[PDB]
Amino acid sequence: TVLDRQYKLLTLFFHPHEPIHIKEQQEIAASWDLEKNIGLYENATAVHLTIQMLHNNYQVPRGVPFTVLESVHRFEISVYYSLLYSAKTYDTFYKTAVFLRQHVNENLFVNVLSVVILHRSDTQDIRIPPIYDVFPSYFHNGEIMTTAQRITTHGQRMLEHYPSTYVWENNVVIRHNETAWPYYCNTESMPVSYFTHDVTLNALYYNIKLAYPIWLRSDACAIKEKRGELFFFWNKQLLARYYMERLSVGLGEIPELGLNEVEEGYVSGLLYHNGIPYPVRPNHLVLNHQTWHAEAIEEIEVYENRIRDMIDQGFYITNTGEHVSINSPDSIDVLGRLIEANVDSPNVQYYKDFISIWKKVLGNSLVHESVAFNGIPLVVPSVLEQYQTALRDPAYYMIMKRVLKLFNLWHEHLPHYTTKELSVPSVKIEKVEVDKLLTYFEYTNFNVTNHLHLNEKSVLVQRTRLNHKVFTVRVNVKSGVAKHVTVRFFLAPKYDSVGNEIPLNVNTQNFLLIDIFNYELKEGDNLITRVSSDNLLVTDEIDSASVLFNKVDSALNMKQNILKTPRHLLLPKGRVGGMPFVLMVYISEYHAPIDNTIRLTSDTLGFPVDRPLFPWMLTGVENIFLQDVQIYHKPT
Amino acid sequence: TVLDRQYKLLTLFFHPHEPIHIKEQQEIAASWDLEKNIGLYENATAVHLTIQMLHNNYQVPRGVPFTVLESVHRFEISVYYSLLYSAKTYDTFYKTAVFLRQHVNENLFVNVLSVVILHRSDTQDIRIPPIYDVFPSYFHNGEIMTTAQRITTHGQRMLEHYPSTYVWENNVVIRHNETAWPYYCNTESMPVSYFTHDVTLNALYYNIKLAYPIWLRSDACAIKEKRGELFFFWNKQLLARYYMERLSVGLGEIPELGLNEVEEGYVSGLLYHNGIPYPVRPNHLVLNHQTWHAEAIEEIEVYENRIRDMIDQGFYITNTGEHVSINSPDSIDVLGRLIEANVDSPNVQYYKDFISIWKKVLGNSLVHESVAFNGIPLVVPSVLEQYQTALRDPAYYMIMKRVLKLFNLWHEHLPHYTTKELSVPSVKIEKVEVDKLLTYFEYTNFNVTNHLHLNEKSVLVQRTRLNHKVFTVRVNVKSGVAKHVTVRFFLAPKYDSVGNEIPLNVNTQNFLLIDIFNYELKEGDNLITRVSSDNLLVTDEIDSASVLFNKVDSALNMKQNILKTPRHLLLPKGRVGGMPFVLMVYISEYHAPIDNTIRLTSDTLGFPVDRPLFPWMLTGVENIFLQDVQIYHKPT
Amino acid sequence: NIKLAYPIWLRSDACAIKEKRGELFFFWNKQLLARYYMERLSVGLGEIPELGLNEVEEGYVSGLLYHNGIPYPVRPNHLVLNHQTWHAEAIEEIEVYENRIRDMIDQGFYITNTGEHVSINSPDSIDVLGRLIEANVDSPNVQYYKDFISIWKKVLGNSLVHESVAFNGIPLVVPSVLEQYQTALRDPAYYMIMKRVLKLFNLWHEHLPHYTTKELSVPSVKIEKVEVDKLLTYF
Numbered sequence A, B: 001t002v003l004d005r006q007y008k009l010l011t012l013f014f015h016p017h018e019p020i021h022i023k024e025q026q027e028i029a030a031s032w033d034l035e036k037n038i039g040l041y042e043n044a045t046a047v048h049l050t051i052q053m054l055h056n057n058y059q060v061p062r063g064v065p066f067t068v069l070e071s072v073h074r075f076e077i078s079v080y081y082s083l084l085y086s087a088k089t090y091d092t093f094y095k096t097a098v099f100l101r102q103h104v105n106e107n108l109f110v111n112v113l114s115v116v117i118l119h120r121s122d123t124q125d126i127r128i129p130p131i132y133d134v135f136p137s138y139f140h141n142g143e144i145m146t147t148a149q150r151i152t153t154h155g156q157r158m159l160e161h162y163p164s165t166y167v168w169e170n171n172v173v174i175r176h177n178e179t180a181w182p183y184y185c186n187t188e189s190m191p192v193s194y195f196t197h198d199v200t201l202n203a204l205y206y207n208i209k210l211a212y213p214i215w216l217r218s219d220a221c222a223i224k225e226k227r228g229e230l231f232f233f234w235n236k237q238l239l240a241r242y243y244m245e246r247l248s249v250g251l252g253e254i255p256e257l258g259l260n261e262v263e264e265g266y267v268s269g270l271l272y273h274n275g276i277p278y279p280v281r282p283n284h285l286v287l288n289h290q291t292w293h294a295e296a297i298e299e300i301e302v303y304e305n306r307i308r309d310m311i312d313q314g315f316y317i318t319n320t321g322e323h324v325s326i327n328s329p330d331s332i333d334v335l336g337r338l339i340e341a342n343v344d345s346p347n348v349q350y351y352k353d354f355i356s357i358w359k360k361v362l363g364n365s366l367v368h369e370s371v372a373f374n375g376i377p378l379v380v381p382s383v384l385e386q387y388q389t390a391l392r393d394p395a396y397y398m399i400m401k402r403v404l405k406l407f408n409l410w411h412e413h414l415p416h417y418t419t420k421e422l423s424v425p426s427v428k429i430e431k432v433e434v435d436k437l438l439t440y441f442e443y444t445n446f447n448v449t450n451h452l453h454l455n456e457k458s459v460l461v462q463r464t465r466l467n468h469k470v471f472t473v474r475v476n477v478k479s480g481v482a483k484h485v486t487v488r489f490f491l492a493p494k495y496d497s498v499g500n501e502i503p504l505n506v507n508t509q510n511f512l513l514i515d516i517f518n519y520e521l522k523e524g525d526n527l528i529t530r531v532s533s534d535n536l537l538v539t540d541e542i543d544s545a546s547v548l549f550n551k552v553d554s555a556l557n558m559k560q561n562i563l564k565t566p567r568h569l570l571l572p573k574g575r576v577g578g579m580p581f582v583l584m585v586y587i588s589e590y591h592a593p594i595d596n597t598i599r600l601t602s603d604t605l606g607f608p609v610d611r612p613l614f615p616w617m618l619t620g621v622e623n624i625f626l627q628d629v630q631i632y633h634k635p636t
Numbered sequence C: 001n002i003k004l005a006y007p008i009w010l011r012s013d014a015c016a017i018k019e020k021r022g023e024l025f026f027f028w029n030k031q032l033l034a035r036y037y038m039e040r041l042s043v044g045l046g047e048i049p050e051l052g053l054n055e056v057e058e059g060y061v062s063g064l065l066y067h068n069g070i071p072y073p074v075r076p077n078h079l080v081l082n083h084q085t086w087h088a089e090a091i092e093e094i095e096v097y098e099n100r101i102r103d104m105i106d107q108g109f110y111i112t113n114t115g116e117h118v119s120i121n122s123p124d125s126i127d128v129l130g131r132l133i134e135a136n137v138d139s140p141n142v143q144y145y146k147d148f149i150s151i152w153k154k155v156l157g158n159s160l161v162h163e164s165v166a167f168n169g170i171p172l173v174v175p176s177v178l179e180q181y182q183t184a185l186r187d188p189a190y191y192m193i194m195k196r197v198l199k200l201f202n203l204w205h206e207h208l209p210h211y212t213t214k215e216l217s218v219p220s221v222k223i224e225k226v227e228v229d230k231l232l233t234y235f
């Protein structure tokens, strides 16, 4: 019965903005009544709250932007999640989903239903469609969407007048985004536009926040996920990759964010479904004038000073006034939880969310204090207030760099690793060599037909993306005696924006983990010959909505999880003629430990680059090797 | 043959963005060739230039915003106007118009064809459609246009799901703009949004600049128009009306524009045809930082200092170095021409256009120095760079207030009027009384069907506008002996934003001329009983494109000229309970003096309020009377 | 050596009068700035920064020492020019002089020492234009058209003026790198100032009529193909 259930849940994601077209779903929406069917829900309080909200009309109006950073939106989405998750039977769950689809905003319903499907036992096999297919308007420029609407409604008669559009195959018409948006931010935004505007990266951020919502309290499974450590590690990896891209395109180090003025602005060029332009941050934005920006920055400074005091003093304050030490090396998780100010933080009243205030300030979304129903505020969020568009703005990377400065301060106070924790007896690496590192640009097609308001075709968008050829890394190692070992590869830049070789201690923060795997080392001489195509950290493209629908309706793979980095974004572009980089191979013992499942050997994720490392403490540690490589770009 | 010619010229304005659909026009476009038909054009140089431009493709690309402030755009539009105007026969003119419609940008073609029709003898009867019907996208928000597209393409099946839209009559569907755009500039922009965003006002500005393009040199007819005096008078009238509106809504005096920072920003909420959002000026914009704004402001300061020096020294410098005096009272025209820096200015090389630089600076249109054909720059103009959207921004009023400060400086140097120039023998005004002054808001419908890309309905937009009830002004006057006299009425505010009564000398700059007419005064007692419905200065609404098309195809009025203020914008709103104003009745002798035709008694348009006036010099002048009135607003 | 050949304090003779001093000045400055921009693009530094009248972001530390052993003046980063300092007065004088030059360029004539107007609208007036901009001893009127480039150099050298004099006479000065021709080119501020002067020159050239197809064409001479063997550079 998997196929039919998946088909129905897909039909729930066919046209969010438009109303229900399938008749029996209308019958269910008109027939079901929560009041009399309270007995089928475990959480009766959620049922009462939902009934009250739906009766008083105290809900976010339909056809309006939705943001989780607003309090009332969080309350509404949490209540709906509690109601949906408390469904005893799958039938009750589906019937509540239909009713909410009828009586709930599109974005909120999609998000809550996806979260419920991911975290429900009865729906551990259902596959949810990609976000960039349900709402294409968050990943393509407004001109593209308007042209799509025109070419569709024209009946493809004036389409042949358009030279940009073309018919690649029957029933599909494709455009070019190569020639468009001549007006753009420029500054530091254009050279890295092939990485920051990538659809897959924003989709990955959205899916990550689907797996770990800020408004959802962890269960036994989510309590072993080490939420804070994942936050820190993922932010570090993203910032290291972004810095590598900037060095590749010659833009320099990530600008440091102050408290007086921000020089770089952002113009999104995106449009909401209704047609409201996004807020724009001007260049040379002033933060020390008579504006709400000043008050927001003062609150941000207070909260960050509280975090700094907690880090330095070595303990945090409970909600009653007790001191809880965080000086042990295993307190990184609670530190991250406190910094994030999620619902799992011990004390959110004193440790508040300054990152959201940073996002509000640097989004320059004019607060007009407008409310509907004498209730829910009406907000026009900027790109930074949406996880599916935040990564397009450099300000996000600047803010995360500040948070990573806080994290580095905390890690600095920790004792440095010893020659016993960081050494494996009688394992010496001889030589490490990669076959080649080449990158090239290629074309890809995305389906944006779900935005078209069909009455009674399939428009696609062509985009340019980076990719790399398969590469093999071969290392020879002395093994001493037989062992079961783990090998980790790290990649870092070798020269900074000016030309001086970066010391290893500084590079410790710029090392990007690209592969980790097990091996059984024999006695004597060995050979590791890892191929990039075998790594499980990076995955291939997930099947599109159309492909999944075809494979389902016509009637598995475990190499496509929503919480993995796309393969084509693993390797930096480099330069034509070669760009130098540093590879680091580290071998350690194997210390023995589907929607949201990731686990490796029990140890800090960034080991051994989480703490600062110095050359003088690597003498006597032979199982770590630092080689130099060159990354090339194939021009086309 | 008027009807058929008008029908064809209307068909030339049916779908600018879309290509030619009528077959014989395609045949003409494919058959006509300028090279062999040079003999039918008087200006052969224009023919050669047009041929060269069309062969080299050195022209503005189609489907791109067009602005006259750019040099190459001016050159192209001037060349096309020269080509069209040099058509010996009407047939040649129409055949060139079709060819250009086929091979020219939409906005440029519409503008040039309208100008040619207005200034051509063979087309002095043709009536051109309103601008707000040809390009509705410049007068309504992007959300409205997107909703229109959706309701049209949906086949009016999901339209009935929309509660906003409704069917007022057969074949027409109407919306509401009352509930939309909750995100808005606020500050000083919302309380006067009913006046600054009025469609008729922007259309009036566009038609005025159609009558007097900056790139067209005047002929005998246009040389008697006193271009500079018209510029000054119209700007003064607009600023006085805007100040009256601000006082009515309690916003205060027009802010003074400096050279360091502009506090008030603007968000248009408009979208171009393709779907590119308009530039946004942030609040508290800084002009004294390391930006191109500083250089632009320095050039502006240099040019304005040149103007100030020319005004103070009493003479202007010719292109050879000669001094030409401007100290006479009849030099206002050349002064205005110099300030405007039009093609009729004596010396544009030394006296340059600083107002355009002000518009560029305060539009905050990011210059990205992008060019097509290795030629024509690509520009995304702001609202201030288009005459059909400039009036929506307060910065325009601030800039015009600065220019009016320059004009007031010039007028101050002139000698004050005497008791002989300002007096009429034996004519004493006894009493002046108006019956009532009431204002109310009403609904109106605009047709935006021409934007819809119909394949193989008629959507309308409902807007709220101000209007007034008919009022009668009755004055009793002693006449002495029989005479033929002219009576002028002026309206001004009585109290400023704080509460002090404004002295007459300051109010001289705030007097708005509302009526001027002739009369024959008898001997003894007389009675003037003017009714607002008789004034010819203000006109009624012009027939829409649909109405004109119906009246033409089915098969005159002279009270509808494109260069007259709409009647409903004549009177300030006032306040509920009454707002005090000052009326001034002035009687003078009758000194004896269709597309663009306006002439009155030979005298300065702003007489006697062009020069400063003082109470002590009005003793002995009995033919001028100052009464007080109250304007009321009917709330609904 | 160039300033040895054409000193600002030496009046030209028959030989130096055929040298077209102003045109040489303009051409050499343009060539230097084009080469510098090519170098910047080669090393990925971007376009030459535009010099304003409020603040200069880039500073300079020479690292040089005079014969006696006095360190050179240092310009700090983010130097402020709109505060209560002599920099403001110097910048005001610079602005006045540059506005005088702009007015002379736009009006089409220059003012003599007596008050006469001399036209500069012909294409062969580039030499006198350069002489006026340089304010050398060969300029027609140095009293009205003064040397603003020297004031720019003084301002951007940040040489602290201490008003010290010897013999009750000759001032004692510690010049910066910009005040010496043998060290001026080490500072980007020089290139910025010359870019401003070249903006003035480009304004003047823009007012000139564009070349025609008769001045710019040679009858019956068509170029087929151009090819270079190789372009390689090494340290």
Ligand SMILES: *[C@@H]1O[C@H](CO)[C@@H](O[C@@H]2O[C@H](CO)[C@@H](O[C@@H]3O[C@H](CO[C@H]4O[C@H](CO[C@H]5O[C@H](CO)[C@@H](O)[C@H](O)[C@@H]5O)[C@@H](O)[C@H](O[C@H]5O[C@H](CO)[C@@H](O)[C@H](O)[C@@H]5O)[C@@H]4O)[C@@H](O)[C@H](O[C@H]4O[C@H](CO)[C@@H](O)[C@H](O)[C@@H]4O[C@H]4O[C@H](CO)[C@@H](O)[C@H](O)[C@@H]4O[C@H]4O[C@H](CO)[C@@H](O)[C@H](O)[C@@H]4O)[C@@H]3O)[C@H](O)[C@H]2NC(C)=O)[C@H](O)[C@H]1NC(C)=O
Binding pocket: A043, A045, A046, A049, A078, A079, A082, A083, A318, A319, A320, A342, A343, A344, A345, A346, A347, A348, A349
């Ligand atoms: C079915 O559906 C419903 C609806 O969908 C779901 O209901 C939600 O359920 C969750 C979980 O139960 C609730 O969250 C918790 O709520 C309680 C109660 O908060 C309410 O009352 C507060 C006022 O009383 C509190 O303060 C007064 C003094 O002023 C005090 O006398 C009283 O005893 C009590 O402490 C309100 O303040 C509060 O909301 C107000 O304040 C908020 C904060 O400023 C503000 O945001 C609100 O807008 C409003 O202004 C609310 O009305 C909370 O006590 C509890 O708080 C814990 O977690 C937060 C972080 O999320 C943390 O900051 C707190 O310090 C506290 O942390 C303790 O518990 C954590 C786990 O919950 C634990 O991880 C911490 O370590 C800590 O516990 C450990 O340490 C502490 C000492 O630090 C120790 O005492 C403990 O024993 C332990 O050792 C949560 O916020 C939602 O409120 C509720 N929502 C609704 C709408 O119903 C329901 O979950 C669904 N059920 C099922 C089965 O699915």
Ligand SMILES: *[C@@H]1O[C@H](CO)[C@@H](O[C@@H]2O[C@H](CO)[C@@H](O[C@@H]3O[C@H](CO[C@H]4O[C@H](CO[C@H]5O[C@H](CO)[C@@H](O)[C@H](O)[C@@H]5O)[C@@H](O)[C@H](O[C@H]5O[C@H](CO)[C@@H](O)[C@H](O)[C@@H]5O)[C@@H]4O)[C@@H](O)[C@H](O[C@H]4O[C@H](CO)[C@@H](O)[C@H](O)[C@@H]4O[C@H]4O[C@H](CO)[C@@H](O)[C@H](O)[C@@H]4O[C@H]4O[C@H](CO)[C@@H](O)[C@H](O)[C@@H]4O)[C@@H]3O)[C@H](O)[C@H]2NC(C)=O)[C@H](O)[C@H]1NC(C)=O
Binding pocket: B043, B045, B046, B049, B078, B079, B082, B083, B318, B319, B320, B342, B343, B344, B345, B346, B347, B348, B349, C121, C122, C206, C207, C208, C209
């Ligand atoms: C058929 O089609 C064609 C194409 O559609 C139409 O052609 C257009 O026709 C108009 C009108 O004829 C032209 O405008 C006039 O152009 C002339 C010539 O300008 C050209 O040449 C300039 C260079 O030569 C000038 O300077 C040199 C020195 O450097 C000097 O030696 C030479 O004698 C001459 O003076 C170029 O500079 C100029 O363009 C360049 O410069 C522009 C300005 O910076 C710049 O914008 C350009 O981009 C380019 O860089 C061009 O190539 C102009 O002389 C004439 O200028 C008058 O008007 C302007 C204001 O518009 C004003 O500033 C000038 O000072 C001058 O004013 C005198 O004439 C006015 C009337 O024209 C008059 O109102 C003024 O009072 C003044 O006249 C009185 O006072 C003066 C003293 O101040 C005195 O001398 C007079 O005798 C009199 O007493 C116009 O700009 C278009 O150029 C032309 N365009 C094209 C593409 O062909 C044609 O009209 C159509 N024909 C028909 C029948 O329909």
Ligand SMILES: *[C@@H]1O[C@H](CO)[C@@H](O[C@@H]2O[C@H](CO)[C@@H](O[C@@H]3O[C@H](CO[C@H]4O[C@H](CO[C@H]5O[C@H](CO)[C@@H](O)[C@H](O)[C@@H]5O)[C@@H](O)[C@H](O[C@H]5O[C@H](CO)[C@@H](O)[C@H](O)[C@@H]5O)[C@@H]4O)[C@@H](O)[C@H](O[C@H]4O[C@H](CO)[C@@H](O)[C@H](O)[C@@H]4O[C@H]4O[C@H](CO)[C@@H](O)[C@H](O)[C@@H]4O[C@H]4O[C@H](CO)[C@@H](O)[C@H](O)[C@@H]4O)[C@@H]3O)[C@H](O)[C@H]2NC(C)=O)[C@H](O)[C@H]1NC(C)=O
Binding pocket: C112, C113, C114, C136, C137, C138, C139, C140, C141, C142, C143
């Ligand atoms: C042997 O050794 C000695 C020492 O080594 C050498 O002596 C040097 O020789 C040179 C060349 O002769 C001198 O330069 C010229 O000096 C004269 C005189 O200037 C002195 O007097 C001025 C005051 O009198 C002036 O103003 C009053 C009104 O106030 C007026 O009534 C009077 O008639 C006269 O006009 C002083 O102001 C001046 O110094 C003061 O002012 C300076 C400027 O502010 C200031 O710097 C000083 O610090 C001081 O404050 C001085 O004491 C100048 O008249 C002459 O000026 C010309 O050149 C300059 C640019 O260098 C230009 O600005 C002037 O406008 C003027 O330009 C005319 O002549 C140019 C050629 O000389 C020519 O190119 C111009 O086109 C122009 O000529 C043409 O147009 C004009 C109209 O514009 C027209 O009248 C002409 O007929 C013609 O058509 C020079 O500065 C040195 O002063 C002198 N130095 C010393 C220490 O002796 C000597 O050269 C050696 N001899 C040999 C054979 O080798």
Ligand SMILES: *[C@@H]1O[C@H](CO)[C@@H](O[C@@H]2O[C@H](CO)[C@@H](O)[C@H](O)[C@H]2NC(C)=O)[C@H](O)[C@H]1NC(C)=O
Binding pocket: A014, A171, A172, A447, A448, A449, A450, A458, A460, A544, A545, A546, A547, A549
């Ligand atoms: C893009 O996605 C749409 C679904 O949003 C696809 O629509 C399908 O088109 C095929 C055409 O043969 C139909 O048989 C299916 O029934 C359609 N499905 C739905 C849900 O409408 C469309 O084919 C996709 N196009 C591409 C190129 O992937």
Ligand SMILES: *[C@@H]1O[C@H](CO)[C@@H](O[C@@H]2O[C@H](CO)[C@@H](O)[C@H](O)[C@H]2NC(C)=O)[C@H](O)[C@H]1NC(C)=O
Binding pocket: B014, B171, B172, B447, B448, B449, B450, B458, B460, B544, B545, B546, B547, B549
């Ligand atoms: C709005 O304007 C359009 C033209 O842009 C009008 O279209 C006309 O509609 C009538 C309907 O009976 C047709 O007979 C005409 O042939 C149409 N003209 C064109 C040029 O298409 C439309 O009627 C107008 N609607 C309103 C309410 O004024």
Ligand SMILES: [Cu+2]
Binding pocket: A134, A135, A136, A137, A138, A273, A450, A451
């Ligand atoms: Cu969408």
Ligand SMILES: [Cu+2]
Binding pocket: A261, A284, B289, B290
């Ligand atoms: Cu700044």
Ligand SMILES: [Cu+2]
Binding pocket: B134, B135, B136, B137, B138, B273, B450, B451
């Ligand atoms: Cu339009």
Ligand SMILES: [Cu+2]
Binding pocket: A289, A290, B261, B284
């Ligand atoms: Cu401010």
Ligand SMILES: [Cu+2]
Binding pocket: C055, C078
């Ligand atoms: Cu600074």
